[PDB]
Amino acid sequence: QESVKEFLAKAKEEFLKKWESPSQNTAQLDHFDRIKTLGTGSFGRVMLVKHKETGNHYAMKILDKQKVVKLKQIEHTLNEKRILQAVNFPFLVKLEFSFKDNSNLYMVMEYVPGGEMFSHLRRIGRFSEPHARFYAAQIVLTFEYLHSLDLIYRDLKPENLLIDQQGYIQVTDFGFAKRVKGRTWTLCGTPEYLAPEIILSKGYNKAVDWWALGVLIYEMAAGYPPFFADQPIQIYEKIVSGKVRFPSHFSSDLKDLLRNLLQVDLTKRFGNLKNGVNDIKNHKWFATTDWIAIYQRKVEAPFIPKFKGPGDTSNFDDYEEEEIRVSINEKCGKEFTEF
Ligand SMILES: NC(=O)c1cccc(N)c1
Numbered sequence: 032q033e034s035v036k037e038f039l040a041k042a043k044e045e046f047l048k049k050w051e052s053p054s055q056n057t058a059q060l061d062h063f064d065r066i067k068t069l070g071t072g073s074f075g076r077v078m079l080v081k082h083k084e085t086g087n088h089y090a091m092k093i094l095d096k097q098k099v100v101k102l103k104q105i106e107h108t109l110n111e112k113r114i115l116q117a118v119n120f121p122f123l124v125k126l127e128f129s130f131k132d133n134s135n136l137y138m139v140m141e142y143v144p145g146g147e148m149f150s151h152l153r154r155i156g157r158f159s160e161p162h163a164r165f166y167a168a169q170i171v172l173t174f175e176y177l178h179s180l181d182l183i184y185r186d187l188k189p190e191n192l193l194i195d196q197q198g199y200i201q202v203t204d205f206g207f208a209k210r211v212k213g214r215t216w217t218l219c220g221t222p223e224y225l226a227p228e229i230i231l232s233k234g235y236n237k238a239v240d241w242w243a244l245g246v247l248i249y250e251m252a253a254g255y256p257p258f259f260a261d262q263p264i265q266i267y268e269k270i271v272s273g274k275v276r277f278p279s280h281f282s283s284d285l286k287d288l289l290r291n292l293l294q295v296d297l298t299k300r301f302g303n304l305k306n307g308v309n310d311i312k313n314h315k316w317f318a319t320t321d322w323i324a325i326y327q328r329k330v331e332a333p334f335i336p337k338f339k340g341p342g343d344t345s346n347f348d349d350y351e352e353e354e355i356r357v358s359i360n361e362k363c364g365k366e367f368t369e370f
């Protein structure tokens with residue numbers, strides 16, 4: 032409908048204005064108190080912080096510039112920040128501030144105290160189809176938005192989907208997101224979620240996100256992903272094979288949708304055909320979904336996470352609290368000039 036076309040045209044206009052003139056250097060480290068480590072990785076960490084003047088809590092992603100360089104993530108980190116400062120959609124975590132110092136890059140996000148979908152899914156076992164469908168619809172709309180801006184997300188997995196106070200999704204971690212007209216080539220993403228064309232080193236496009244949605248829906252509804260195995264090489268063999276087995280409890284509609292998302296031929300995969308996202312939105316598995324009501328957050332959620340307030344970290348796990356230091360000397364200044 033012209034309504035969707037005009038919505039997306041305005042979304043692109045607003046994205047492009049911020050994309051062309053990114054914000055920079057909008058806070059500094061000593062504006063915040065450090066509260067707790069919420070997550071770690073090979074080149075950074077995410078910390079719960081509190082702004083010392085307003086009292087607001089945020090999730091601060093801290094990336095070590097030297098480790099970003101070593102692990103060949105320079106362009107990826109520049110992508111992440113430039114994209115996040117430019118997007119605006121109900122199911123994307125908002126970047127509130129960014130800055131850098133001699134040692135680190137900082138992305139200060141809205142804090143989502145409900146934690147990762149991953150934890151809730153593993154705790155409950157599997158989600159009912161209505162519950163999985165509620166989350167899936169949010170991802171469908173989010174990908175419609177991102178792909179219309181020529182953005183590919185490239186890291187869909189339960190760990191990157193936080194549950195907010197209303198029970199809705201907030202997608203976090205844009206470390207692999209990229210603005211791509213046409214194809215791109217980088218091997219990235221988590222093994223169980225990789226499309227065949229990534230595994231086979233092809234030039235790939237937004238169809239990889241629709242493949243990953245199939246994996247996510249399967250994992251939400253089954254409790255385990257479709258191509259599981261013990262080593263990555265065995266996972267990859269299963270992914271490229273064209274074979275998937277479905278639990279008997281899956282509905283026929285769910286199986287049909289999944290065969291079309293988990294289509295190994297990218298030219299036949301739902302989301303990548305002439306009808307685009309509408310092949311997904313109009314599929315019978317989504318017949319009960321009111322797309323506008325989801326976008327407007329008017330649907331009652333399946334599940335409201337339990338938490339005590341905006342400083343509650345109970346839905347995140349415990350990590351060694353390590354020092355974060357800032358060198359007296361600037362590191363990697365040239366590489367990160369635009370950040
Ligand atoms: N935005 C958040 O609350 C958050 C928390 C932990 C990890 C990430 N990536 C984000």
Ligand SMILES: NC(=O)c1cccc(N)c1
Binds near residue numbers: 063080
């Ligand atoms: N140095 C640190 O680990 C840190 C993290 C967050 C806030 C502040 N002020 C310091």
